[PDB]
mmCIF file of C-alpha atoms and ligand atoms in Angstrom:
data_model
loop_
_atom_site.group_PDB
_atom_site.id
_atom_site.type_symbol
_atom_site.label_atom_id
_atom_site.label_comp_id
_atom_site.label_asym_id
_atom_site.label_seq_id
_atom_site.Cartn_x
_atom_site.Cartn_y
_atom_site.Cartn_z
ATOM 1 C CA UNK A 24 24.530 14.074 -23.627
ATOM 2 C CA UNK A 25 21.905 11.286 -22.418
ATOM 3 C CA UNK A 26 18.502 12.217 -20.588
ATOM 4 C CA UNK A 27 18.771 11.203 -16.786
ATOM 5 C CA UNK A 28 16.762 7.940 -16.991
ATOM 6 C CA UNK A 29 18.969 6.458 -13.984
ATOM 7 C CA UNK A 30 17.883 9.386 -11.940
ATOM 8 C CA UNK A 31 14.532 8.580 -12.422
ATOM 9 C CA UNK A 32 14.418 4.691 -12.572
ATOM 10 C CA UNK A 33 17.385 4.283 -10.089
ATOM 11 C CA UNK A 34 16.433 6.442 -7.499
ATOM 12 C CA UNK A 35 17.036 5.385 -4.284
ATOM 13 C CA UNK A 36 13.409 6.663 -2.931
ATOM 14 C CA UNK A 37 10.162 6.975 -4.560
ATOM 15 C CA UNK A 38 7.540 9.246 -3.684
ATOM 16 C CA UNK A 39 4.455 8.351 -2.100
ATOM 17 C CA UNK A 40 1.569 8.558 -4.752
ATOM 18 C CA UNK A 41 -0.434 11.126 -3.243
ATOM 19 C CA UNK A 42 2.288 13.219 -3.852
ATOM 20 C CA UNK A 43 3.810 12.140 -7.182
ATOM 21 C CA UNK A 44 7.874 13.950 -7.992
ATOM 22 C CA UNK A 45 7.644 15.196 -11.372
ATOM 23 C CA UNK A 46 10.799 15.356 -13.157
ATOM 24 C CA UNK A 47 11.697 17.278 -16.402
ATOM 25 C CA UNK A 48 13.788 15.561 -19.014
ATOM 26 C CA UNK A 49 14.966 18.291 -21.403
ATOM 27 C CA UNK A 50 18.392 19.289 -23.506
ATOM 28 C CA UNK A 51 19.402 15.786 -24.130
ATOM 29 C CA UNK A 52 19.306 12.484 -25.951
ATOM 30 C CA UNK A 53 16.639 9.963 -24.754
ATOM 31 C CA UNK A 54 17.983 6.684 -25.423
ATOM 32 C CA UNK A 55 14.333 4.817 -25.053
ATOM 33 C CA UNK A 56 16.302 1.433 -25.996
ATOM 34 C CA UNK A 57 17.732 0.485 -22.831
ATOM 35 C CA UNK A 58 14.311 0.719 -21.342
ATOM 36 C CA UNK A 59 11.992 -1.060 -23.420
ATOM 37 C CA UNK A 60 14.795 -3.720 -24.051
ATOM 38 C CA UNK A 61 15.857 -4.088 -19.867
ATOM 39 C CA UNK A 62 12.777 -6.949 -18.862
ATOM 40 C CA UNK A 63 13.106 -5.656 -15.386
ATOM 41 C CA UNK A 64 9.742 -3.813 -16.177
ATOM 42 C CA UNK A 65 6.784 -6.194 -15.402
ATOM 43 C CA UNK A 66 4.370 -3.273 -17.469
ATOM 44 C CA UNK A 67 5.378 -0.677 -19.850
ATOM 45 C CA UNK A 68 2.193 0.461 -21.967
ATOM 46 C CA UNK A 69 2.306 2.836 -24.323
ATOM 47 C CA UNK A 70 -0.299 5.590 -25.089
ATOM 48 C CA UNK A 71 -0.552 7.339 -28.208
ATOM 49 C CA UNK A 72 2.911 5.980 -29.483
ATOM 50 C CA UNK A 73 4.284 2.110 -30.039
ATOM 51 C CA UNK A 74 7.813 1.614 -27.409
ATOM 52 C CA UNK A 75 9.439 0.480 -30.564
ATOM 53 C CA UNK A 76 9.403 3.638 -32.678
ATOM 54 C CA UNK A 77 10.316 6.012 -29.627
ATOM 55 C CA UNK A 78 13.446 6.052 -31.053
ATOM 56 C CA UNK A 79 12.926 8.060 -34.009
ATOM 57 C CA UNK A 80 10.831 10.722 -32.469
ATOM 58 C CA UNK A 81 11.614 13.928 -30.540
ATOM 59 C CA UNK A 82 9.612 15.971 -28.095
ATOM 60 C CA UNK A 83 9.057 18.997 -26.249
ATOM 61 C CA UNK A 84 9.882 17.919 -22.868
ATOM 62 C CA UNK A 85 9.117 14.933 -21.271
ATOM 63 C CA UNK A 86 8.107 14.722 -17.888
ATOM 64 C CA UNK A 87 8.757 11.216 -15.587
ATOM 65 C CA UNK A 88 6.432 11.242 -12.858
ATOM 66 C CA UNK A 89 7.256 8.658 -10.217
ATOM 67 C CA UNK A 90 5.593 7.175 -7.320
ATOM 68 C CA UNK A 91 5.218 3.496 -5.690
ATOM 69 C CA UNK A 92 1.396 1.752 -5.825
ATOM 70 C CA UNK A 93 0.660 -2.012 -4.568
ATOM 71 C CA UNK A 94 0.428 -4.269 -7.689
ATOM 72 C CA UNK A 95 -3.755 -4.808 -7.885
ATOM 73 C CA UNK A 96 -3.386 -0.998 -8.585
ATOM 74 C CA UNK A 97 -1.085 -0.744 -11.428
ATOM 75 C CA UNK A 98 -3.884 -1.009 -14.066
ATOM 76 C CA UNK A 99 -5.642 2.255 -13.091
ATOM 77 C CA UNK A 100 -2.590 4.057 -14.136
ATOM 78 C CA UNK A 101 -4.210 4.168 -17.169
ATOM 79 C CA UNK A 102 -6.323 7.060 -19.222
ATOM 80 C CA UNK A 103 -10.163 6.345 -19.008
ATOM 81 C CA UNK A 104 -9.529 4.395 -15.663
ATOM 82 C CA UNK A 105 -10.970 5.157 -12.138
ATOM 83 C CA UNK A 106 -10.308 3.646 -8.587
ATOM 84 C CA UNK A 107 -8.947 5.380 -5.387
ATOM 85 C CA UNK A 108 -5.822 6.043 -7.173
ATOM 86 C CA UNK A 109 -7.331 7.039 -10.501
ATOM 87 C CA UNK A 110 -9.366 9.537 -8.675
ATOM 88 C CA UNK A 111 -7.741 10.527 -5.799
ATOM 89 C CA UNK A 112 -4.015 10.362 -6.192
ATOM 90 C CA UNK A 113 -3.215 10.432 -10.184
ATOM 91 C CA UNK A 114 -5.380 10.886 -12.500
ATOM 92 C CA UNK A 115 -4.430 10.177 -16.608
ATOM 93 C CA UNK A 116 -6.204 12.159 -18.866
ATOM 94 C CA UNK A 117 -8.219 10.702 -21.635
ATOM 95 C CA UNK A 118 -5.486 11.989 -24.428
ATOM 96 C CA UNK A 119 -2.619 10.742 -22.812
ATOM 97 C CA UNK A 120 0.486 10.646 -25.152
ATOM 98 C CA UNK A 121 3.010 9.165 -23.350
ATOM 99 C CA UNK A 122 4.162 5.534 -21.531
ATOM 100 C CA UNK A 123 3.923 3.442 -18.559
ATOM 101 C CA UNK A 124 6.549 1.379 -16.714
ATOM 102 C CA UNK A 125 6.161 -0.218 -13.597
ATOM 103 C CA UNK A 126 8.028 -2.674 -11.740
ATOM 104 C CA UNK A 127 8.381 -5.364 -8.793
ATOM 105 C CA UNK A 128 10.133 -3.902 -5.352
ATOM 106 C CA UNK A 129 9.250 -6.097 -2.796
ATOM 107 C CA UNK A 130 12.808 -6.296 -2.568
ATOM 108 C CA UNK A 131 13.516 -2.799 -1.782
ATOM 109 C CA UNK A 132 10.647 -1.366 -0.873
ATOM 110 C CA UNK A 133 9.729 -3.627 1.662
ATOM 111 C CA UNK A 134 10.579 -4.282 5.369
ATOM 112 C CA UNK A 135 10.291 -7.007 7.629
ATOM 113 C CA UNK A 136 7.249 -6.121 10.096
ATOM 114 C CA UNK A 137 6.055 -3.550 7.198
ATOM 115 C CA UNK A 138 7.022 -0.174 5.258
ATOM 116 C CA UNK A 139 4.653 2.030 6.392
ATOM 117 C CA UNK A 140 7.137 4.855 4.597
ATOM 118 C CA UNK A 141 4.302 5.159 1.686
ATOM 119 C CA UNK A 142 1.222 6.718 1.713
ATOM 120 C CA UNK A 143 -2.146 7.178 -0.248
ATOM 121 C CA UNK A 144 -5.228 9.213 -0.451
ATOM 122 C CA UNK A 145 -8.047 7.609 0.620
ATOM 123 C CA UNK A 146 -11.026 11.088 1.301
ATOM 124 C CA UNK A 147 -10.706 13.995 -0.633
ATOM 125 C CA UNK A 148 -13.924 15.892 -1.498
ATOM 126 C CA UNK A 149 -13.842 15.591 -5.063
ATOM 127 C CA UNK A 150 -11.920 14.085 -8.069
ATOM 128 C CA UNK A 151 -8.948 15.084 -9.285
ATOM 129 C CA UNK A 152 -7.965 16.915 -12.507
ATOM 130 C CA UNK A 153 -5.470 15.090 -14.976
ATOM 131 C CA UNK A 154 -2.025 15.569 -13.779
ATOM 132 C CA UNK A 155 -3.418 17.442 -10.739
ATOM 133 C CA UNK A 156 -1.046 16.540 -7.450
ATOM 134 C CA UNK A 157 -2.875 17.411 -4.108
ATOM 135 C CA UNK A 158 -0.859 17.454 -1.074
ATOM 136 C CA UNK A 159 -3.209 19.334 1.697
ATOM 137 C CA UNK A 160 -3.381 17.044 4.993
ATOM 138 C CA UNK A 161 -6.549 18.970 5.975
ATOM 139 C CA UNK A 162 -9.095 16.873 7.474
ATOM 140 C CA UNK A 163 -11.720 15.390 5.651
ATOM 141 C CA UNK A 164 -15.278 15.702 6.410
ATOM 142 C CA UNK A 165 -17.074 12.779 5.647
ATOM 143 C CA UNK A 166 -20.110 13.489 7.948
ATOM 144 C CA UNK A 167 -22.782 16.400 8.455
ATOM 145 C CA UNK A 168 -20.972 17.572 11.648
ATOM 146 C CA UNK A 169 -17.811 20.556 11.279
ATOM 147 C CA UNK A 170 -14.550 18.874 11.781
ATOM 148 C CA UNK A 171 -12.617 22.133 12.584
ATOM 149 C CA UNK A 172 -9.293 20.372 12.737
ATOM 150 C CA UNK A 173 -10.196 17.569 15.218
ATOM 151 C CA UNK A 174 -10.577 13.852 13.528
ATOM 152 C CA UNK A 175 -13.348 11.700 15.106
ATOM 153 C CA UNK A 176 -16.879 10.540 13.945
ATOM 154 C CA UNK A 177 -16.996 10.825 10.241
ATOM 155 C CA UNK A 178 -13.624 13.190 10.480
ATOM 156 C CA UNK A 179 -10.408 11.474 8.746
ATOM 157 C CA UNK A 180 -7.114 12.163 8.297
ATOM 158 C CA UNK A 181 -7.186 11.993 4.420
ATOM 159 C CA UNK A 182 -3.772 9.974 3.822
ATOM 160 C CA UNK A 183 -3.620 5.981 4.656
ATOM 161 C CA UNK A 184 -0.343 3.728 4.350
ATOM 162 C CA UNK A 185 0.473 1.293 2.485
ATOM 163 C CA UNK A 186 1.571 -1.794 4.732
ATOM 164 C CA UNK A 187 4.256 -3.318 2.489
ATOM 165 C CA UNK A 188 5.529 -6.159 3.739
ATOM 166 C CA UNK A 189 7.379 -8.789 2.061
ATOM 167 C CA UNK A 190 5.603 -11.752 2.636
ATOM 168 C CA UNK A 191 1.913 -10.074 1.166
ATOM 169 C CA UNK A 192 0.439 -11.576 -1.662
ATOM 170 C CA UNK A 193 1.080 -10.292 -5.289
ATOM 171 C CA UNK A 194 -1.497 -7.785 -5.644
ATOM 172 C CA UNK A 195 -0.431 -6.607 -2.208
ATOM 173 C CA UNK A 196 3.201 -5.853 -3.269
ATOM 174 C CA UNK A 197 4.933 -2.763 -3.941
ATOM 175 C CA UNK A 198 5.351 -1.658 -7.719
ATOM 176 C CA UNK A 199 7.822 1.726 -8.731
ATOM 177 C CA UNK A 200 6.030 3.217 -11.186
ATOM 178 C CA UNK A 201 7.222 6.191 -13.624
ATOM 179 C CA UNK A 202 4.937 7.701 -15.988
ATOM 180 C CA UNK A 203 6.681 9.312 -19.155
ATOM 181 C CA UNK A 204 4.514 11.932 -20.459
ATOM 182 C CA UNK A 205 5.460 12.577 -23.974
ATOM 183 C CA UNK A 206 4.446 16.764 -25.123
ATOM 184 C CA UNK A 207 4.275 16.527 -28.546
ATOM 185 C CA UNK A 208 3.019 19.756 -29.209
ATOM 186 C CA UNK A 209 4.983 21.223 -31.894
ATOM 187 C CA UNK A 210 8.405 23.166 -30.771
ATOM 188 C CA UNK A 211 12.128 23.506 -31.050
ATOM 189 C CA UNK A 212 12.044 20.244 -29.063
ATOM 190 C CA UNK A 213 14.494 19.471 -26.823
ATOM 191 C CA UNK A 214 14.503 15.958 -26.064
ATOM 192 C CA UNK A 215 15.222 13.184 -29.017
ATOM 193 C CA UNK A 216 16.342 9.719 -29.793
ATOM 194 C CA UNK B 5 -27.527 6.417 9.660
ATOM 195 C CA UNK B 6 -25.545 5.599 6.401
ATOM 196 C CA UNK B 7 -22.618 7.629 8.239
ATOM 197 C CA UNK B 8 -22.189 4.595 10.733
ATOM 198 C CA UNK B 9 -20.968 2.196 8.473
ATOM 199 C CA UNK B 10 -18.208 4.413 7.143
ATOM 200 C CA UNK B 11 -16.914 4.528 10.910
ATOM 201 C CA UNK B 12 -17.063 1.136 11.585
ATOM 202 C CA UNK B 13 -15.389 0.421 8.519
ATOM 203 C CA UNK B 14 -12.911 2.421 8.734
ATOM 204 C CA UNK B 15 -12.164 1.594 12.131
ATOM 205 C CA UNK B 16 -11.838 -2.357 11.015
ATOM 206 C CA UNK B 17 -8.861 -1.423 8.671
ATOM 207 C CA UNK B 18 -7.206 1.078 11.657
ATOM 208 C CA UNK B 19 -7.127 -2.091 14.135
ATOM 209 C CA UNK B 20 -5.480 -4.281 11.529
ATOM 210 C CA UNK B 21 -3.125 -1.879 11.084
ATOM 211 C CA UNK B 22 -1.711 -2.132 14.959
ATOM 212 C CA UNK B 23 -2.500 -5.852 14.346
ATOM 213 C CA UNK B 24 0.558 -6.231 11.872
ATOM 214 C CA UNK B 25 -1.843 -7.419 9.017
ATOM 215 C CA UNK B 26 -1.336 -5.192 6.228
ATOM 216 C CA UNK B 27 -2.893 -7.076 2.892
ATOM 217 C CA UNK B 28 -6.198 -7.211 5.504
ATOM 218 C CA UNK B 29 -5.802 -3.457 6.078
ATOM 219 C CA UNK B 30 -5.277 -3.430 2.318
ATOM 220 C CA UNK B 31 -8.154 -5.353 1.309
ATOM 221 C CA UNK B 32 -10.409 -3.503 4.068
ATOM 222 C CA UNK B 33 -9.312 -0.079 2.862
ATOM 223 C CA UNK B 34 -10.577 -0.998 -0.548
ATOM 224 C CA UNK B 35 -14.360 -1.511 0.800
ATOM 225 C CA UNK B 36 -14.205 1.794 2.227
ATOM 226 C CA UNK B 37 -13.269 3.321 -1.144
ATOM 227 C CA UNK B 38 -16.346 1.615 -2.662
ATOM 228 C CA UNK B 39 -18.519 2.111 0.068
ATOM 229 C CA UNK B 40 -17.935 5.488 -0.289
ATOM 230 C CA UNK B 41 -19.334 5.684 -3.647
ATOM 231 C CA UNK B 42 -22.428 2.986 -3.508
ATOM 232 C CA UNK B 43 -25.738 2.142 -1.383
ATOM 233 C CA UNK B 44 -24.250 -1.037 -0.455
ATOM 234 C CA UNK B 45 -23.747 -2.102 2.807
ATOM 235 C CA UNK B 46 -22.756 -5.586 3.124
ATOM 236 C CA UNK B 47 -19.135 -3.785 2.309
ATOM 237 C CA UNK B 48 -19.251 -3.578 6.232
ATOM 238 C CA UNK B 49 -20.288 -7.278 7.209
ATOM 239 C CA UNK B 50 -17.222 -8.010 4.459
ATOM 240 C CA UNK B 51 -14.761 -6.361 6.747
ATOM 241 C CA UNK B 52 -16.171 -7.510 9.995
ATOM 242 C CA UNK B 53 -15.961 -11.165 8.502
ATOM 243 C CA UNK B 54 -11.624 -10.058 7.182
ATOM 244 C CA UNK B 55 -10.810 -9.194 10.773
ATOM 245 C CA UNK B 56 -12.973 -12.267 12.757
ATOM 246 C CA UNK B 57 -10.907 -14.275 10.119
ATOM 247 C CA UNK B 58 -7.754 -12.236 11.139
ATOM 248 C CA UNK B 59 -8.355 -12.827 14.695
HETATM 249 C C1 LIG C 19 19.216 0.824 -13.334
HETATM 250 O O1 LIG C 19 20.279 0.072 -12.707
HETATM 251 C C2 LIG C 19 20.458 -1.255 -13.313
HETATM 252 C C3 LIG C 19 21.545 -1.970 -12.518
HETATM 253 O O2 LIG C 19 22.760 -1.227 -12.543
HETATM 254 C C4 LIG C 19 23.926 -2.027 -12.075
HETATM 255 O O3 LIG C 19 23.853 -2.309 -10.656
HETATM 256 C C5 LIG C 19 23.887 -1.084 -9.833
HETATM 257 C C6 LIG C 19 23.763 -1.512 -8.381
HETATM 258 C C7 LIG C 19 25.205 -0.291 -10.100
HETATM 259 O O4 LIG C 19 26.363 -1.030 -9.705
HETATM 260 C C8 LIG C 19 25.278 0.050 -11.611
HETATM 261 O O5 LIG C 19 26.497 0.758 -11.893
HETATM 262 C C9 LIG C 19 25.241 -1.263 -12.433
HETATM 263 O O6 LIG C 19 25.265 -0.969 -13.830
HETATM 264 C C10 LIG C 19 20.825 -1.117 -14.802
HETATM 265 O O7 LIG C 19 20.927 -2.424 -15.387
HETATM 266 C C11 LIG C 19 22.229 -2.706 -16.100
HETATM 267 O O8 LIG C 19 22.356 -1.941 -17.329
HETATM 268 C C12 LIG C 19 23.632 -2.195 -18.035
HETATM 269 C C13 LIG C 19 23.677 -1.287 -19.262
HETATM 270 O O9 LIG C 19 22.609 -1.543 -20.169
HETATM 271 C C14 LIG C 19 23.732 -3.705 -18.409
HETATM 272 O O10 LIG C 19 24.975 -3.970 -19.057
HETATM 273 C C15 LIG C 19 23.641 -4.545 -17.106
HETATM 274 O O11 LIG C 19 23.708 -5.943 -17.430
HETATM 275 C C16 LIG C 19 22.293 -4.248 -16.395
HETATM 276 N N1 LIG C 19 22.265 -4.983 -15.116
HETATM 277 C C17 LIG C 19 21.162 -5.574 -14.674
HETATM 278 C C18 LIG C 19 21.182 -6.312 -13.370
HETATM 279 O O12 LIG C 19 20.109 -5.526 -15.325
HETATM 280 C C19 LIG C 19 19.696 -0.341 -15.515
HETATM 281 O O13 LIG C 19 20.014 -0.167 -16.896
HETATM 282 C C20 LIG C 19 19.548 1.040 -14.848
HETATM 283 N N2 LIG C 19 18.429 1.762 -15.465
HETATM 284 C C21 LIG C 19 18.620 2.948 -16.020
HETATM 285 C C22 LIG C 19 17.472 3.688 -16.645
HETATM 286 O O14 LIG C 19 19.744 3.463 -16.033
#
């Protein structure tokens, strides 16, 4: 009885970041090996644990988070980091127990002419708790004036896309990124190696 | 007065959206992300000078 790691690294669509799918690994045996060991991940960073010794542990539940970033923002998925994803999107909490994968898919999540599938927040009013998701498409005020539902001077549609296309630059690529947060907190503990 | 740069700005990255230049969009959207938190505004003669070179 293996954990679902093919539904979560496999999957055949991501979710934008704004909006990150949280999945919950419970009930079954977490066979960390065959990720660490793939190089097909370009990042996997560890918090609060080494990759090798994920093996021998077990925990509460584990949670993958998924979502696809371009590459320049890959390092504020990160505890202690800011940025427009940091703070706007997904925000890491300083404490963070748990690991981060990322990976190349310019060849799958990107289209001749652009994928404009993805999207970002770029205005929100305030930063975001750790492991808060917002998904409100309310209009953001930027400016003294009311908005009252009508975008215009200093009134924005909160959400940009992300333009992937596959001829953009490195930083300016896709990367599918799942976040493994590890609850260590002490129970029955229903996920091990 | 501050107020007008954030339009412009953000303008700059809408138009090189329908221009089919994403990384410029990209790189434009990230000036209004810093603008947004800063008294600097040379963030807007930055993304005046991405889309002339776009043009
Ligand atoms: C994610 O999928 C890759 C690729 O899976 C293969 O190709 C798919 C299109 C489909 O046909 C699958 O049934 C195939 O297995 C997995 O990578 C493979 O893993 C196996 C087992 O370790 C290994 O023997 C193969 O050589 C690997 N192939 C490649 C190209 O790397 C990967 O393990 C999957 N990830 C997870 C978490 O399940």
């Amino acid at each position: 009885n293996l954990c679902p790691f093919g539904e979560v690294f496999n999957a055949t669509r991501f979710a934008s970041v704004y909006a990150w799918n949280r999945k919950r690994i419970s009930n079954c045996v977490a066979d960390y090996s065959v990720l660490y060991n793939s190089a097909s991940f370009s990042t996997f960073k560890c918090y609060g644990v080494s990759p090798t010794k994920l093996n021998d542990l077990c925990f509460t539940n584990v949670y993958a988070d998924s979502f696809v970033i371009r590459g320049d923002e890959v390092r504020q998925i990160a505890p202690g980091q800011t940025g427009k994803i940091a703070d706007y999107n997904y925000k890491l909490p300083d404490d963070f127990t748990g690991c981060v994968i990322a990976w190349n898919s310019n060849n799958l999540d990107s289209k001749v002419g652009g994928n404009y599938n993805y999207l970002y927040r770029l205005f929100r009013k305030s930063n975001l708790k750790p492991f808060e998701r917002d998904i409100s498409t309310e209009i953001y005020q930027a400016g003294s004036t009311p908005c009252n539902g009508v975008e215009g001077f200093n009134c924005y549609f909160p959400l940009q896309s992300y333009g992937f296309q596959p001829t953009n630059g490195v930083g300016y690529q896709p990367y599918r990124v799942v976040v493994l947060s590890f609850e260590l907190l002490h129970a029955p503990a229903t996920v091990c190696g | 007065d501050k107020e007008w740069i954030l339009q412009k700005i953000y303008e700059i990255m809408r138009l090189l959206d329908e221009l089919g230049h994403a990384e410029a969009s990209m790189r434009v959207s990230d000036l209004i992300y810093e603008f947004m938190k800063k008294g600097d505004e040379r963030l807007l003669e930055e993304a005046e000078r991405l889309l002339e070179e776009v043009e």
